[PDB]
Paper text:
Crystal structures of HSC70-NBD/BAG1 bound to the unsubstituted quinazoline scaffold 10, the 7-methyl 4-aminoquinazoline 13 and the 6-methoxy 4-aminoquinazoline 16 all showed a similar binding mode to 8, confirming the quinazoline scaffold as a stable and attractive start point for fragment elaboration. An overlay of 10 and ATP-bound HSC70-NBD/BAG1 structures showed that the adenine N-9 atom in ATP providing the linkage to the ribose ring, overlaps with the exocyclic 4-amino group in the fragment hit, suggesting a vector to grow the fragment into the ribose sub-pocket of the ATP-binding site. Modification of the 4-amino group with a single methyl group was tolerated and yielded 20, strengthening this hypothesis. Compared to parent fragment 10, elaboration with the carbocyclic ribose mimic 23 resulted in a 7-fold increase in affinity. By contrast, and to our surprise, in all HSC70-NBD/BAG1 structures bound to carbocycle-containing ligands and small fragments, phosphate-binding loop 2 adopts the distorted conformation also present in the nucleotide-free HSC70-NBD/BAG1.
Numbering used by the authors:
A (entry chain C): 1 to 381
B (entry chain D): 149 to 259
Write the structure that this text describes.
Protein backbone atom coordinates (compact mmCIF):
# COMPACT_ATOMS: atom_id res chain seq x y z
CA UNK A 1 0.00 0.00 0.00
CA UNK A 2 1.09 3.60 -0.77
CA UNK A 3 1.50 6.31 1.96
CA UNK A 4 -1.80 7.68 3.33
CA UNK A 5 -3.08 10.89 4.95
CA UNK A 6 -3.27 11.78 8.67
CA UNK A 7 -6.34 10.69 10.66
CA UNK A 8 -8.32 11.88 13.66
CA UNK A 9 -9.03 9.38 16.43
CA UNK A 10 -11.57 9.85 19.26
CA UNK A 11 -10.34 7.23 21.81
CA UNK A 12 -13.45 6.92 23.98
CA UNK A 13 -14.31 5.13 27.23
CA UNK A 14 -16.95 2.84 25.64
CA UNK A 15 -16.54 3.53 21.87
CA UNK A 16 -13.81 4.86 19.57
CA UNK A 17 -14.23 6.73 16.23
CA UNK A 18 -11.82 7.48 13.35
CA UNK A 19 -12.17 10.21 10.71
CA UNK A 20 -10.24 11.48 7.70
CA UNK A 21 -10.29 14.89 5.98
CA UNK A 22 -10.38 14.43 2.17
CA UNK A 23 -11.97 16.31 -0.80
CA UNK A 24 -12.68 19.37 1.40
CA UNK A 25 -14.70 17.36 3.99
CA UNK A 26 -14.37 14.94 6.94
CA UNK A 27 -15.37 11.34 6.32
CA UNK A 28 -16.14 9.24 9.40
CA UNK A 29 -14.82 5.77 8.65
CA UNK A 30 -17.01 2.70 9.08
CA UNK A 31 -15.41 -0.43 10.50
CA UNK A 32 -15.40 -3.94 9.01
CA UNK A 33 -18.87 -4.53 10.48
CA UNK A 34 -19.98 -1.26 8.86
CA UNK A 35 -20.20 0.67 12.14
CA UNK A 36 -19.06 4.32 12.36
CA UNK A 37 -18.01 3.79 16.03
CA UNK A 38 -16.08 0.79 17.38
CA UNK A 39 -16.43 -0.51 20.95
CA UNK A 40 -13.36 0.08 23.12
CA UNK A 41 -13.34 -3.62 24.04
CA UNK A 42 -10.59 -6.26 24.03
CA UNK A 43 -11.43 -9.94 24.73
CA UNK A 44 -9.01 -12.73 25.51
CA UNK A 45 -10.16 -16.29 24.80
CA UNK A 46 -8.77 -19.85 24.82
CA UNK A 47 -7.53 -19.33 21.20
CA UNK A 48 -7.56 -15.62 20.26
CA UNK A 49 -7.56 -11.91 21.09
CA UNK A 50 -10.67 -10.06 19.82
CA UNK A 51 -10.99 -6.24 19.47
CA UNK A 52 -14.02 -3.99 18.95
CA UNK A 53 -17.36 -5.42 17.84
CA UNK A 54 -16.07 -9.02 17.89
CA UNK A 55 -14.91 -8.49 21.54
CA UNK A 56 -18.21 -6.79 22.59
CA UNK A 57 -20.32 -9.51 20.82
CA UNK A 58 -18.94 -12.23 23.10
CA UNK A 59 -19.01 -10.40 26.45
CA UNK A 60 -22.05 -12.34 27.75
CA UNK A 61 -20.09 -15.55 27.12
CA UNK A 62 -16.70 -14.39 28.46
CA UNK A 63 -17.31 -11.60 31.00
CA UNK A 64 -14.17 -12.07 33.16
CA UNK A 65 -11.75 -11.96 30.22
CA UNK A 66 -13.38 -9.10 28.28
CA UNK A 67 -11.77 -5.71 29.04
CA UNK A 68 -13.40 -2.31 28.57
CA UNK A 69 -13.22 1.06 30.39
CA UNK A 70 -9.41 1.13 30.11
CA UNK A 71 -9.69 4.90 29.70
CA UNK A 72 -10.94 5.06 33.37
CA UNK A 73 -7.62 3.36 34.39
CA UNK A 74 -5.13 4.94 31.94
CA UNK A 75 -2.36 7.01 33.61
CA UNK A 76 -3.75 6.36 37.12
CA UNK A 77 -2.10 4.92 40.25
CA UNK A 78 -3.62 1.71 41.67
CA UNK A 79 -4.56 3.53 44.96
CA UNK A 80 -6.44 6.32 43.07
CA UNK A 81 -10.01 6.66 44.51
CA UNK A 82 -11.36 6.37 40.88
CA UNK A 83 -9.57 3.00 40.35
CA UNK A 84 -10.77 1.61 43.73
CA UNK A 85 -14.41 2.68 43.16
CA UNK A 86 -14.64 1.51 39.49
CA UNK A 87 -13.09 -1.97 40.00
CA UNK A 88 -15.96 -3.10 42.26
CA UNK A 89 -18.26 -2.87 39.21
CA UNK A 90 -16.05 -4.55 36.56
CA UNK A 91 -16.29 -8.30 35.87
CA UNK A 92 -12.52 -8.42 35.01
CA UNK A 93 -9.72 -8.31 37.62
CA UNK A 94 -7.55 -5.20 38.22
CA UNK A 95 -4.30 -5.92 40.12
CA UNK A 96 -1.57 -3.75 41.67
CA UNK A 97 1.89 -3.93 40.05
CA UNK A 98 4.35 -1.66 41.99
CA UNK A 99 1.64 1.03 42.49
CA UNK A 100 0.27 0.74 38.92
CA UNK A 101 -3.03 -0.96 37.91
CA UNK A 102 -3.01 -3.85 35.44
CA UNK A 103 -6.01 -5.74 34.09
CA UNK A 104 -5.57 -9.50 34.72
CA UNK A 105 -7.14 -12.08 32.38
CA UNK A 106 -7.02 -15.73 31.32
CA UNK A 107 -5.53 -15.76 27.75
CA UNK A 108 -4.90 -19.09 25.87
CA UNK A 109 -5.24 -20.98 29.19
CA UNK A 110 -2.61 -18.73 30.92
CA UNK A 111 -2.97 -15.89 33.47
CA UNK A 112 -1.78 -12.66 31.75
CA UNK A 113 -1.73 -9.01 32.90
CA UNK A 114 -1.76 -5.81 30.79
CA UNK A 115 -1.20 -2.12 31.54
CA UNK A 116 -4.15 0.19 30.57
CA UNK A 117 -1.99 1.77 27.75
CA UNK A 118 -1.35 -1.74 26.29
CA UNK A 119 -5.14 -2.31 26.16
CA UNK A 120 -5.68 1.16 24.64
CA UNK A 121 -2.86 0.47 22.08
CA UNK A 122 -4.90 -2.62 20.89
CA UNK A 123 -7.96 -0.33 20.37
CA UNK A 124 -5.77 2.28 18.54
CA UNK A 125 -4.28 -0.55 16.37
CA UNK A 126 -7.89 -1.48 15.42
CA UNK A 127 -8.72 2.23 14.61
CA UNK A 128 -5.48 2.44 12.48
CA UNK A 129 -6.54 -0.80 10.58
CA UNK A 130 -10.13 0.52 10.06
CA UNK A 131 -8.62 3.69 8.41
CA UNK A 132 -6.20 1.61 6.23
CA UNK A 133 -9.01 -0.80 5.13
CA UNK A 134 -11.10 2.16 3.90
CA UNK A 135 -8.27 4.23 2.31
CA UNK A 136 -6.31 1.33 0.82
CA UNK A 137 -3.20 3.21 2.03
CA UNK A 138 -0.82 2.94 5.04
CA UNK A 139 -1.92 5.15 8.02
CA UNK A 140 0.82 6.28 10.49
CA UNK A 141 -0.03 9.89 11.49
CA UNK A 142 -2.83 10.63 13.89
CA UNK A 143 -4.29 13.17 16.27
CA UNK A 144 -5.63 11.48 19.39
CA UNK A 145 -8.10 13.13 21.75
CA UNK A 146 -8.21 13.09 25.60
CA UNK A 147 -10.60 14.77 28.14
CA UNK A 148 -9.58 18.32 29.18
CA UNK A 149 -9.23 17.15 32.85
CA UNK A 150 -6.56 14.55 32.02
CA UNK A 151 -3.32 15.05 33.93
CA UNK A 152 0.33 14.74 32.81
CA UNK A 153 0.39 11.01 33.54
CA UNK A 154 -2.97 10.30 31.80
CA UNK A 155 -1.90 12.28 28.66
CA UNK A 156 1.55 10.58 28.57
CA UNK A 157 -0.04 7.10 28.96
CA UNK A 158 -2.45 7.89 26.03
CA UNK A 159 0.48 9.06 23.82
CA UNK A 160 2.35 5.82 24.86
CA UNK A 161 -0.71 3.76 23.74
CA UNK A 162 -0.39 5.59 20.36
CA UNK A 163 3.32 4.82 20.07
CA UNK A 164 2.81 1.16 20.99
CA UNK A 165 0.22 0.78 18.22
CA UNK A 166 2.75 2.09 15.68
CA UNK A 167 1.15 5.54 15.39
CA UNK A 168 3.01 8.83 15.11
CA UNK A 169 0.87 11.07 17.39
CA UNK A 170 0.94 14.52 15.69
CA UNK A 171 -0.85 16.06 18.63
CA UNK A 172 -2.88 15.14 21.68
CA UNK A 173 -5.80 17.50 21.86
CA UNK A 174 -8.59 18.04 24.32
CA UNK A 175 -11.99 16.56 23.41
CA UNK A 176 -13.81 19.99 23.86
CA UNK A 177 -11.11 21.69 21.69
CA UNK A 178 -11.73 18.97 19.03
CA UNK A 179 -15.56 19.59 19.14
CA UNK A 180 -14.94 23.43 18.84
CA UNK A 181 -12.65 22.82 15.80
CA UNK A 182 -15.42 20.62 14.16
CA UNK A 183 -17.82 23.67 14.19
CA UNK A 184 -14.97 25.97 13.08
CA UNK A 185 -15.46 28.19 16.12
CA UNK A 186 -11.77 29.02 15.92
CA UNK A 187 -12.35 30.57 12.48
CA UNK A 188 -15.12 33.03 13.49
CA UNK A 189 -14.02 36.69 13.13
CA UNK A 190 -14.09 39.14 16.05
CA UNK A 191 -12.71 39.24 19.60
CA UNK A 192 -12.28 36.47 22.20
CA UNK A 193 -14.97 33.79 22.28
CA UNK A 194 -16.32 31.95 25.31
CA UNK A 195 -17.33 28.43 24.31
CA UNK A 196 -19.32 25.90 26.39
CA UNK A 197 -19.00 22.22 25.39
CA UNK A 198 -21.87 20.02 26.72
CA UNK A 199 -20.66 16.38 26.40
CA UNK A 200 -23.18 13.67 27.39
CA UNK A 201 -22.11 10.32 25.91
CA UNK A 202 -19.99 7.22 26.39
CA UNK A 203 -21.00 6.69 30.05
CA UNK A 204 -19.57 10.07 31.22
CA UNK A 205 -20.90 13.66 31.45
CA UNK A 206 -18.37 16.47 30.73
CA UNK A 207 -18.95 20.25 30.71
CA UNK A 208 -16.03 22.42 29.52
CA UNK A 209 -15.68 26.14 29.04
CA UNK A 210 -13.06 27.39 26.60
CA UNK A 211 -11.84 30.73 25.36
CA UNK A 212 -10.69 31.14 21.77
CA UNK A 213 -8.66 34.21 20.73
CA UNK A 214 -6.79 34.44 17.35
CA UNK A 215 -6.95 30.63 17.00
CA UNK A 216 -5.65 30.02 20.52
CA UNK A 217 -7.53 27.73 22.90
CA UNK A 218 -7.64 28.01 26.67
CA UNK A 219 -9.52 25.71 29.05
CA UNK A 220 -11.15 28.04 31.64
CA UNK A 221 -13.07 25.30 33.58
CA UNK A 222 -14.21 21.63 33.59
CA UNK A 223 -17.16 19.97 35.44
CA UNK A 224 -19.47 16.95 35.14
CA UNK A 225 -20.45 13.49 36.38
CA UNK A 226 -17.97 10.65 35.50
CA UNK A 227 -20.79 8.03 35.72
CA UNK A 228 -23.81 9.58 33.94
CA UNK A 229 -25.00 8.50 30.52
CA UNK A 230 -27.60 6.77 28.37
CA UNK A 231 -27.53 3.57 30.46
CA UNK A 232 -29.03 5.48 33.42
CA UNK A 233 -31.89 6.62 31.22
CA UNK A 234 -32.36 3.04 30.03
CA UNK A 235 -32.43 1.76 33.61
CA UNK A 236 -35.28 4.11 34.47
CA UNK A 237 -37.28 2.82 31.51
CA UNK A 238 -36.58 -0.78 32.51
CA UNK A 239 -37.76 -0.13 36.06
CA UNK A 240 -40.89 1.52 34.72
CA UNK A 241 -41.65 -1.53 32.57
CA UNK A 242 -40.90 -4.05 35.31
CA UNK A 243 -43.37 -2.20 37.58
CA UNK A 244 -45.93 -2.05 34.67
CA UNK A 245 -45.63 -5.88 34.18
CA UNK A 246 -46.23 -6.33 37.96
CA UNK A 247 -49.35 -4.07 37.80
CA UNK A 248 -50.79 -5.77 34.71
CA UNK A 249 -49.81 -9.40 35.38
CA UNK A 250 -48.85 -9.66 39.07
CA UNK A 251 -45.52 -11.25 38.07
CA UNK A 252 -41.93 -10.22 38.87
CA UNK A 253 -39.58 -10.64 35.83
CA UNK A 254 -36.51 -8.96 37.52
CA UNK A 255 -34.92 -12.28 38.64
CA UNK A 256 -35.01 -13.73 35.09
CA UNK A 257 -31.79 -12.32 33.49
CA UNK A 258 -32.94 -13.20 29.93
CA UNK A 259 -36.37 -11.48 30.36
CA UNK A 260 -34.62 -8.34 31.77
CA UNK A 261 -32.06 -8.34 28.89
CA UNK A 262 -34.87 -8.61 26.22
CA UNK A 263 -36.67 -5.74 27.99
CA UNK A 264 -33.42 -3.69 28.29
CA UNK A 265 -32.50 -4.12 24.59
CA UNK A 266 -36.04 -3.03 23.62
CA UNK A 267 -35.88 0.07 25.99
CA UNK A 268 -32.52 1.17 24.44
CA UNK A 269 -34.20 1.15 21.01
CA UNK A 270 -37.44 2.89 22.25
CA UNK A 271 -35.21 5.58 23.85
CA UNK A 272 -33.54 6.24 20.44
CA UNK A 273 -37.02 6.43 18.71
CA UNK A 274 -38.21 9.02 21.33
CA UNK A 275 -35.51 11.48 20.10
CA UNK A 276 -37.35 11.77 16.72
CA UNK A 277 -40.92 10.53 17.57
CA UNK A 278 -43.28 11.43 20.44
CA UNK A 279 -44.17 7.72 21.09
CA UNK A 280 -42.36 4.30 20.93
CA UNK A 281 -44.06 0.88 20.69
CA UNK A 282 -42.65 -2.42 22.05
CA UNK A 283 -43.78 -5.99 21.23
CA UNK A 284 -42.03 -8.83 23.13
CA UNK A 285 -43.61 -12.28 22.67
CA UNK A 286 -43.46 -14.72 25.60
CA UNK A 287 -41.29 -12.33 27.71
CA UNK A 288 -41.88 -14.22 30.98
CA UNK A 289 -44.00 -17.28 31.90
CA UNK A 290 -45.42 -17.32 28.35
CA UNK A 291 -46.86 -13.77 28.67
CA UNK A 292 -46.59 -11.45 25.64
CA UNK A 293 -45.57 -7.88 26.57
CA UNK A 294 -47.09 -5.33 24.10
CA UNK A 295 -46.81 -1.77 25.36
CA UNK A 296 -45.77 1.79 24.48
CA UNK A 297 -44.07 4.84 26.04
CA UNK A 298 -44.56 8.52 25.17
CA UNK A 299 -41.72 11.01 25.06
CA UNK A 300 -43.29 12.78 28.00
CA UNK A 301 -43.39 9.67 30.16
CA UNK A 302 -39.72 9.01 29.38
CA UNK A 303 -38.83 12.61 30.28
CA UNK A 304 -40.65 12.25 33.61
CA UNK A 305 -38.93 9.02 34.64
CA UNK A 306 -35.60 10.75 34.05
CA UNK A 307 -36.62 14.27 35.24
CA UNK A 308 -34.03 14.50 38.09
CA UNK A 309 -31.22 13.16 35.93
CA UNK A 310 -32.00 15.57 33.07
CA UNK A 311 -32.39 18.65 35.28
CA UNK A 312 -29.26 17.58 37.12
CA UNK A 313 -27.16 18.17 33.95
CA UNK A 314 -27.41 22.00 34.60
CA UNK A 315 -25.60 21.77 38.00
CA UNK A 316 -22.21 21.05 36.33
CA UNK A 317 -23.03 23.88 33.76
CA UNK A 318 -23.53 26.36 36.68
CA UNK A 319 -20.37 25.04 38.44
CA UNK A 320 -18.25 25.39 35.17
CA UNK A 321 -19.57 29.04 34.64
CA UNK A 322 -18.66 29.84 38.32
CA UNK A 323 -15.11 28.36 38.03
CA UNK A 324 -14.49 30.25 34.73
CA UNK A 325 -15.71 33.49 36.49
CA UNK A 326 -18.37 33.96 33.75
CA UNK A 327 -22.11 34.74 33.63
CA UNK A 328 -24.26 32.55 31.23
CA UNK A 329 -24.80 35.70 29.02
CA UNK A 330 -20.96 35.71 28.36
CA UNK A 331 -21.04 32.45 26.41
CA UNK A 332 -20.78 33.02 22.66
CA UNK A 333 -21.16 29.35 21.64
CA UNK A 334 -22.78 26.15 22.99
CA UNK A 335 -21.65 22.81 21.47
CA UNK A 336 -23.52 19.47 21.95
CA UNK A 337 -21.45 16.23 21.81
CA UNK A 338 -22.22 12.61 22.86
CA UNK A 339 -25.26 10.57 21.69
CA UNK A 340 -27.45 11.51 24.71
CA UNK A 341 -27.50 15.23 23.63
CA UNK A 342 -29.91 14.04 20.91
CA UNK A 343 -32.59 13.83 23.68
CA UNK A 344 -35.00 16.74 22.95
CA UNK A 345 -35.58 17.50 26.68
CA UNK A 346 -31.82 17.84 27.32
CA UNK A 347 -31.56 20.36 24.39
CA UNK A 348 -34.68 22.23 25.67
CA UNK A 349 -33.31 22.50 29.26
CA UNK A 350 -29.92 23.72 27.95
CA UNK A 351 -31.41 26.27 25.47
CA UNK A 352 -33.86 27.60 28.17
CA UNK A 353 -30.89 27.95 30.60
CA UNK A 354 -29.08 30.08 27.95
CA UNK A 355 -32.29 32.20 27.45
CA UNK A 356 -33.23 30.75 24.02
CA UNK A 357 -29.77 30.68 22.47
CA UNK A 358 -29.24 28.36 19.48
CA UNK A 359 -27.09 25.23 19.95
CA UNK A 360 -24.37 23.85 17.62
CA UNK A 361 -25.80 20.34 16.99
CA UNK A 362 -25.69 19.70 13.13
CA UNK A 363 -22.63 17.40 13.40
CA UNK A 364 -23.51 13.90 14.59
CA UNK A 365 -22.77 14.10 18.35
CA UNK A 366 -21.11 10.66 18.50
CA UNK A 367 -18.67 11.68 15.73
CA UNK A 368 -17.99 15.43 16.38
CA UNK A 369 -14.79 14.83 18.47
CA UNK A 370 -13.26 12.50 15.76
CA UNK A 371 -14.47 15.07 13.14
CA UNK A 372 -12.53 17.91 14.87
CA UNK A 373 -9.47 15.66 15.39
CA UNK A 374 -9.51 14.76 11.59
CA UNK A 375 -9.62 18.50 10.68
CA UNK A 376 -6.69 19.10 13.12
CA UNK A 377 -4.76 16.13 11.63
CA UNK A 378 -5.21 17.58 8.07
CA UNK A 379 -4.09 21.06 9.32
CA UNK A 380 -0.93 19.48 10.91
CA UNK A 381 -0.02 17.50 7.70
CA UNK B 1 -58.54 -12.13 1.43
CA UNK B 2 -56.76 -9.15 3.05
CA UNK B 3 -53.14 -10.40 2.46
CA UNK B 4 -51.03 -7.31 1.88
CA UNK B 5 -47.70 -6.80 -0.03
CA UNK B 6 -46.31 -5.03 3.12
CA UNK B 7 -46.83 -8.25 5.21
CA UNK B 8 -44.68 -10.15 2.60
CA UNK B 9 -41.74 -7.92 3.76
CA UNK B 10 -42.31 -9.05 7.41
CA UNK B 11 -42.78 -12.76 6.51
CA UNK B 12 -39.46 -12.63 4.56
CA UNK B 13 -37.60 -11.18 7.63
CA UNK B 14 -39.22 -13.98 9.79
CA UNK B 15 -38.17 -16.72 7.32
CA UNK B 16 -34.57 -15.46 7.44
CA UNK B 17 -34.77 -15.60 11.26
CA UNK B 18 -36.22 -19.19 11.05
CA UNK B 19 -33.26 -20.25 8.79
CA UNK B 20 -30.79 -18.68 11.30
CA UNK B 21 -32.60 -20.61 14.14
CA UNK B 22 -32.22 -23.87 12.10
CA UNK B 23 -28.44 -23.22 11.79
CA UNK B 24 -27.97 -22.62 15.60
CA UNK B 25 -30.17 -25.71 16.31
CA UNK B 26 -27.81 -27.83 14.07
CA UNK B 27 -24.85 -26.59 16.25
CA UNK B 28 -26.82 -27.50 19.43
CA UNK B 29 -27.43 -31.01 17.93
CA UNK B 30 -23.65 -31.39 17.16
CA UNK B 31 -22.98 -30.36 20.82
CA UNK B 32 -25.46 -33.03 22.09
CA UNK B 33 -23.67 -35.65 19.84
CA UNK B 34 -20.21 -34.57 21.16
CA UNK B 35 -21.50 -34.57 24.78
CA UNK B 36 -22.88 -38.16 24.29
CA UNK B 37 -19.61 -39.15 22.50
CA UNK B 38 -17.43 -38.15 25.44
CA UNK B 39 -19.75 -39.85 27.90
CA UNK B 40 -19.96 -43.20 26.13
CA UNK B 41 -16.50 -42.90 24.55
CA UNK B 42 -12.93 -44.16 25.09
CA UNK B 43 -11.89 -41.52 27.62
CA UNK B 44 -11.36 -42.46 31.31
CA UNK B 45 -14.01 -41.12 33.82
CA UNK B 46 -11.63 -38.32 35.02
CA UNK B 47 -10.56 -37.20 31.47
CA UNK B 48 -14.32 -37.02 30.45
CA UNK B 49 -15.22 -34.23 32.96
CA UNK B 50 -12.37 -32.08 31.46
CA UNK B 51 -13.47 -32.78 27.81
CA UNK B 52 -17.14 -32.03 28.73
CA UNK B 53 -16.20 -28.71 30.43
CA UNK B 54 -14.27 -27.83 27.19
CA UNK B 55 -17.76 -27.68 25.46
CA UNK B 56 -18.81 -24.79 27.79
CA UNK B 57 -17.57 -22.00 25.45
CA UNK B 58 -19.54 -23.58 22.59
CA UNK B 59 -22.80 -24.07 24.65
CA UNK B 60 -22.53 -20.39 25.88
CA UNK B 61 -21.98 -19.24 22.23
CA UNK B 62 -25.15 -21.26 21.24
CA UNK B 63 -27.20 -19.58 23.99
CA UNK B 64 -25.90 -16.12 22.99
CA UNK B 65 -26.88 -16.73 19.34
CA UNK B 66 -30.42 -17.70 20.35
CA UNK B 67 -30.53 -14.53 22.58
CA UNK B 68 -29.52 -12.28 19.64
CA UNK B 69 -32.30 -13.94 17.52
CA UNK B 70 -34.79 -13.07 20.32
CA UNK B 71 -33.54 -9.44 20.35
CA UNK B 72 -33.89 -9.26 16.55
CA UNK B 73 -37.47 -10.72 16.59
CA UNK B 74 -38.26 -8.16 19.38
CA UNK B 75 -37.56 -5.21 16.92
CA UNK B 76 -40.60 -6.23 14.84
CA UNK B 77 -43.83 -4.29 15.16
CA UNK B 78 -46.68 -6.15 13.54
CA UNK B 79 -50.18 -4.71 13.31
CA UNK B 80 -53.17 -6.86 14.40
CA UNK B 81 -54.13 -7.46 10.70
CA UNK B 82 -50.76 -9.24 10.16
CA UNK B 83 -52.17 -12.55 11.55
CA UNK B 84 -49.76 -14.88 9.66
CA UNK B 85 -46.69 -12.75 10.75
CA UNK B 86 -47.98 -12.65 14.37
CA UNK B 87 -48.43 -16.49 14.37
CA UNK B 88 -44.99 -17.15 12.77
CA UNK B 89 -43.34 -14.72 15.27
CA UNK B 90 -45.04 -16.49 18.26
CA UNK B 91 -44.11 -19.96 16.92
CA UNK B 92 -40.49 -18.93 16.35
CA UNK B 93 -40.04 -17.41 19.85
CA UNK B 94 -41.47 -20.60 21.47
CA UNK B 95 -39.19 -22.83 19.33
CA UNK B 96 -36.13 -20.69 20.38
CA UNK B 97 -37.30 -20.83 24.06
CA UNK B 98 -37.54 -24.67 23.89
CA UNK B 99 -33.96 -24.78 22.37
CA UNK B 100 -32.80 -22.41 25.16
CA UNK B 101 -34.22 -24.81 27.81
CA UNK B 102 -32.17 -27.69 26.13
CA UNK B 103 -29.00 -25.44 26.22
CA UNK B 104 -29.63 -25.00 30.00
CA UNK B 105 -29.81 -28.80 30.55
CA UNK B 106 -26.46 -29.21 28.70
CA UNK B 107 -24.95 -26.26 30.70
CA UNK B 108 -26.14 -27.78 34.03
CA UNK B 109 -24.62 -31.23 33.11
CA UNK B 110 -21.08 -30.05 32.09
CA UNK B 111 -18.41 -28.49 34.43
N1 LIG C 1 -27.76 7.64 22.56
C1 LIG C 1 -28.92 8.17 22.12
N2 LIG C 1 -29.75 8.71 23.07
C2 LIG C 1 -30.90 9.23 22.63
N3 LIG C 1 -31.35 9.29 21.37
C3 LIG C 1 -30.53 8.75 20.41
C4 LIG C 1 -30.98 8.77 19.07
C5 LIG C 1 -30.20 8.25 18.07
C6 LIG C 1 -28.97 7.68 18.35
C7 LIG C 1 -28.50 7.64 19.64
C8 LIG C 1 -29.27 8.17 20.71
Amino acid sequence: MSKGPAVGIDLGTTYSCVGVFQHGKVEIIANDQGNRTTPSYVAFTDTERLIGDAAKNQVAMNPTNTVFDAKRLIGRRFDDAVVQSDMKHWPFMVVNDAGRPKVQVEYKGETKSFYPEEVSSMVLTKMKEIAEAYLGKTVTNAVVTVPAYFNDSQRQATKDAGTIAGLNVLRIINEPTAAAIAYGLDKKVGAERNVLIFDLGGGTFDVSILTIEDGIFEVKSTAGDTHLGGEDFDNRMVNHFIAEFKRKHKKDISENKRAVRRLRTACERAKRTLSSSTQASIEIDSLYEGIDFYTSITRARFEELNADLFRGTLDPVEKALRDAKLDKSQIHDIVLVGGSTRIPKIQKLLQDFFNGKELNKSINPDEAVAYGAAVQAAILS
Amino acid sequence: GSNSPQEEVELKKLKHLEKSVEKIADQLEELNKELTGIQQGFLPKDLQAEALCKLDRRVKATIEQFMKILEEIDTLILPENFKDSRLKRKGLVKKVQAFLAECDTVEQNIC
